[PDB]
Design a protein around this ligand. Structure first.
Ligand SMILES: [Mg+2]
Length: 448
């Protein structure tokens, strides 16, 4: 067998049986063998085990002659930004993002914060670590502490015209992850009044693990927006590379609609640019990008595909319906901070509420949201769906699972490559009744 903690795109596992300090040190040794010349940036999140795992990673890297740049407690996007900004050979973020408290992990990048994934170095590292019975060497390189966030903060602020910002009232919900530290460092430079919910970093997570998709966690942000009359609310996952929006009514905004909104925001700054989007939900993004003078570029979902497509296209922005937003000028990386700064600027400049900015789009292209199905046989379940609809002759696309376009409605059906888990997304052309009957029909077929 193989080490279960090595996944398709990162390392994650239960501490200490799936991930521990010895494994972390061996990963540092293995990573040093995979990178071009240069130092390695290390950062970590608020989880209790994260500092010790980072220190073991540093020990392995320095045993292999790599200088380490320790940027300390941070978000995942800061490892991306500093790896690129400091022209490092690579970087590692120690984080489990949104997983349970006994879990941790790592996200690995090389030069320019390019992802290291299972087929681009991560499984080479796994097998090296798995075979490594060598004695731990001693450090032949130094660690430098570099916690200065000035360049990162200046970069974030460069996305908005601060003289155009209004003193909006914004709920911010770090979920006791790390986002509140960055909010507080941005605040002196912004006119907003912040309503801070679950703000203090606490790896014990007394208010729940940081996952704004859980309805109970969703409701703390919604309640703060409604009780304070806030313009909108923002919540983050624990390492805040994902953000989530709540309009002034407390309504959680489905991430699909943020792709089109942010693309229009960016295209006003970078006219004629290309915008990369995923295949799960498409019609609204294609229309909004084209109306703003941009060029939409379809791409398989998952950050490694999006980033490499953005690079090959010189795309200014990429967005996934699942709360991932990527920016060319940000090393083609994802940020949970840039998106809400852009949205706050859009609300400020337009005089429109976030609710009204998305309302007509939600009416024009209603969607199901992503619906997950644990099935006995994913391949047979997909076959049942496709056989049922064969007589309607949908237009089929295989960019990412199966996309089927029927004219006034479409769906995307994708398989989990690890667990027998299908993911369904449906959308229609302004027809909520059709959305529900087709969603339920597909659901019945999948469960059959
Ligand atoms: Mg995350």
């Amino acid at each position: 067998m193989t080490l279960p903690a090595f996944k398709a795109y990162d390392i994650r596992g239960r501490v200490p049986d799936e991930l521990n300090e010895d494994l972390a040190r061996r990963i540092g040794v293995a990573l040093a063998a995979q990178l071009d010349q240069g130092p390695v940036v290390l950062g970590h999140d608020v989880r209790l085990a994260s500092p010790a795992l980072q220190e073991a990673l540093s020990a392995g890297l320095r045993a292999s002659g790599r200088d380490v740049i320790d940027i300390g407690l941070c978000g995942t996007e800061e490892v991306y930004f500093q790896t690129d900004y400091l022209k490092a050979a690579g970087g590692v973020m120690v984080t489990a993002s949104h997983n349970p408290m006994d879990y941790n992990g790592m996200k690995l990048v090389r030069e320019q914060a390019r992802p290291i994934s299972s087929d681009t170095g991560l499984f080479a590292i796994r097998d090296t670590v798995a075979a490594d019975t060598a004695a731990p060497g001693e450090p032949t390189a130094s660690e430098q502490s570099r916690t200065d966030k000035t360049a990162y903060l200046e970069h974030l602020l460069s996305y908005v015209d601060r003289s155009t910002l209004k003193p909006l009232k914004l709920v911010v919900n770090a979920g006791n992850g790390g986002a509140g530290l960055i909010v507080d460092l941005l605040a002196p430079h912004l006119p907003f009044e912040f309503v801070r919910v679950f703000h203090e970093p606490d790896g014990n997570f007394p208010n729940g693990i940081p996952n704004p998709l859980l309805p109970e966690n969703r409701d703390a942000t919604a309640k703060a927006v409604k009780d304070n009359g806030a313009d909108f609310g923002i919540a983050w996952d624990g390492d805040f590379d994902r953000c989530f929006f709540f309009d002034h009514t407390g309504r959680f905004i489905e991430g699909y609609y943020l792709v089109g909104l942010l693309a229009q925001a960016i295209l006003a700054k970078q006219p004629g640019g290309k915008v990369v989007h995923d295949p799960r939900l498409t019609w609204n993004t294609v229309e909004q990008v084209e109306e703003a003078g941009g060029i939409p570029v379809l791409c398989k979902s998952g950050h490694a595909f999006i980033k490499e497509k953005m690079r090959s296209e010189n795309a200014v922005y990429g967005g996934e319906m699942s709360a991932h937003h990527y920016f060319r000028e940000f090393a083609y990386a994802d940020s949970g901070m840039i998106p809400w700064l852009l949205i706050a600027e859009l609300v400020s400049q337009s005089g429109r509420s976030l609710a009204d900015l998305v309302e007509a789009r939600m009416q024009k292209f209603p969607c199901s949201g992503e619906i997950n199905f644990k099935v006995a046989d994913a391949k047979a379940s997909v076959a049942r769906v496709m056989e049922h609809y064969a007589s309607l002759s949908p237009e089929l696309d295989y960019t990412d699972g199966i996309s089927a376009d029927f004219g006034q409605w479409r769906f995307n059906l994708r398989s989990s490559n690890t667990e027998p888990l299908l993911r369904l997304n449906v959308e229609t052309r302004g027809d909520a009744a059709l959305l529900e009957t087709r969603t339920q029909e597909i659901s019945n077929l999948l469960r059959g």
